[PDB]
Symmetry: C5
Subunit: 45 residues, 5 copies
């Protein structure tokens, strides 16, 4: 049959999944940065 | 037709993986938020 | 009903996301780095 | 067929690349989980 | 308008970028491990 339609469904799914990754990574950095600033004021240090 | 069958395979294979990367990062941020909470409550600071 | 233009769009939408995923990973690496250093000069260690 | 064979070559590469990222990532979570437990199981806190 | 040439340029860019992400990742793993080890040999805990 014609697989173009199928090939397009995969990319859209890819871009979808890729969007969650950008958000998760987006949030992860803020935590890491927050982690750095917290460990930056940690007294024992 | 063409290499659609082949090219389609790579894509499905690319998603399967990304789907996994997503979940990995997904859980990772959970392990990074706990770590963040732990340092915050760490009396050593 | 040629899906080329549409397909071509998802691609451009993927790279845009990657471009952003990449930039985020650069800053994250730079942040973690700074955090590894801080932990090293940590007295109580 | 045209640039098809060459596009398939890129897809196969992107796919091999994801694998690597996937793996490197599956390792980060261990390094991070572990790290999490240790920080948690710290007496100085 | 034959869009094959352009999609080929996109795929290639998808691999160029992925190589960055893959390259930036493995370095970060190194830092995360370096971080870990430091914590482990940290007295206070
Ligand atoms: C032909 C379709 C294009 C291929 C789709 C795949 C897109 C590339 C995906 C990149 C994965 C990036 C993952 C980065 C996660 C890093 C997480 C971390 O370091 O904490």
């Amino acid at each position: 049959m014609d697989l173009a339609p199928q090939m397009l469904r995969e990319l859209q799914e890819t871009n979808a999944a890729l969007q969650d990754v950008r958000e998760l990574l987006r949030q992860q950095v803020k935590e890491i940065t927050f982690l750095k600033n917290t460990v930056m004021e940690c007294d024992a240090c």
